[PDB]
Nucleic acid binder design. Sequence first.
DNA 1: CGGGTTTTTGTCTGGCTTCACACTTGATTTGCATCACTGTGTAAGACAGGCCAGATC
DNA 2: GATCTGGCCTGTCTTACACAGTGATACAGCCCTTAACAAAAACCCG
DNA 3: CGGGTTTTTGTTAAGGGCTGTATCACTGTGTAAGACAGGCCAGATC
DNA 4: GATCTGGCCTGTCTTACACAGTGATGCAAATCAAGTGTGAAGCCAGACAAAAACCCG
Lengths: 48, 80, 160, 80
Amino acid sequence: NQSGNKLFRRFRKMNARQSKCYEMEDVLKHHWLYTSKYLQKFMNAHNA
Amino acid sequence: AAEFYKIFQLEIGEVYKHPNASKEERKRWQATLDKHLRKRMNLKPIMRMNGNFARKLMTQETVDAVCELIPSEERHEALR
Amino acid sequence: YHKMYRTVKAITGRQIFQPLHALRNAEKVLLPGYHPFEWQPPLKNVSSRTDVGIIDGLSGLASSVDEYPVDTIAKRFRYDSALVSALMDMEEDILEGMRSQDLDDYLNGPFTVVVKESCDGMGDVSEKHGSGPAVPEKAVRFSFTVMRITIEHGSQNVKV
Amino acid sequence: YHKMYRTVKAITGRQIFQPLHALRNAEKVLLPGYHPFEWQPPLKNVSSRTDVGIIDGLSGLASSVDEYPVDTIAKRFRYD
DNA sequence: CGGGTTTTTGTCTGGCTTCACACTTGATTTGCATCACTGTGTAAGACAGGCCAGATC
DNA sequence: GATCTGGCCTGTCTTACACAGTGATACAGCCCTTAACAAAAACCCG
DNA sequence: CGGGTTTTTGTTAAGGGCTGTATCACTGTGTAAGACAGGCCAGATC
DNA sequence: GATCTGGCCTGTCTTACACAGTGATGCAAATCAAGTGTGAAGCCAGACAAAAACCCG
Ligand SMILES: [Ca+2]
């Protein structure tokens, strides 16, 4: 849905550089790191 | 869902007796449909078709409260 | 983050959080393009380096003015790097699944993996405030997704 | 902040941060309108009620239709 | 207003822990300064309608 | 003979409407004390 | 293979304080519907 | 006597520039590997005697 779009614009607005060259590399890095199982397991470590 | 809403508009058309039909007749049929559905189910009828309203139309209460409009000698159990 | 870290260090006295050095170190550990691996076929038309991550998606598209002009910025990984990194951080999950479904850790493969793929454009991604509506700049991500890892041993297989 | 608090509380076992209601009390101790005080002259045309916080900036204007129109939004503190 | 009754406050004598330097000198990691690079909103800054009185057939 | 026309495609162009995010608000559950019976287990005798 | 004795928790009160999410009144905001504006013909018509 | 025109007057877009952010580099400084080896503190067993303060006869 709009799910990726709001996430992508938020990643462009919060944590990103200028000159449009490092920008897409940074958003690819952060968007990759958001969806790894390892940190996801660290982040839902409250209910167990 | 679009076909079900259409066949309800054409059954309130009762168009197995009216073979030809103008756009005014179908518009008034949709008008009577939204009037009776806002009087019975009291929902917000809209032509912008979504999934929530489509799921909202899919129950026996809806098919009952719409099928009771026409003088269905048969169409009741067919729709059922 | 650095402000928060230095304030909690100043208040607590002992250090609990971390500065950015070890963060970026563990980041490039977790990033693709870091761990070694191999292929039993030689993989024609594929490079042999195990240590390349982010590259241009253009793959050497010469965008000189004498040729067909584009402006679409494209960044990409290498595919096998993404596969091996996804495997290495689902490694604990598949270890626990192997310990759960009545097996040992010293098993070999060949583990059969089912991978679906997807791409979809997202419409506008732009916040233009200099004069208002400049361009409906449309962007698109292309992605993969693992959904099933199995191993066949003896007679049958098992969804590990 | 709630996410950060619950994650570090889970991962250390100790509760190093604070939850949200304690944060609300810690901010209510720092807003205007909490401590008592008085004035040796009784401060004419000032309501001496001593627990007022963010009040409406318009001081009770006259936003009805039959009055001069004003569509601004003003929020203020009392000065004392 | 002196003495009773607590309350601390020490005491060697021997007998336990327990880090503190002492360098050593070479990795490690930590702190802060520097770097590349656009976004934006602003206060100069012309600027042209507009309205004058001066000029003129 | 050439020209308007109804109809059939078709490429925009607006819009409702389903969600996203937020501080504040409202409950839904969780320690605490007698207490006298109710159970689960572990080991050992038999 | 089964009891005797020993080694550990549940059970409902009651009336609180505490905490962890669920909800609540809200806007804002993009992407599908589907409506419509032309565009281009096969046949009526001068 | 009645239009034409340079001169000011003033509410306009219009437009640059400095900084605020973003990450990532890059050294200089502090700190830590281990190595003994004393060796100074700190606490307790044994039983034995002073300072400081509030109440009652
Ligand atoms: Ca889409």
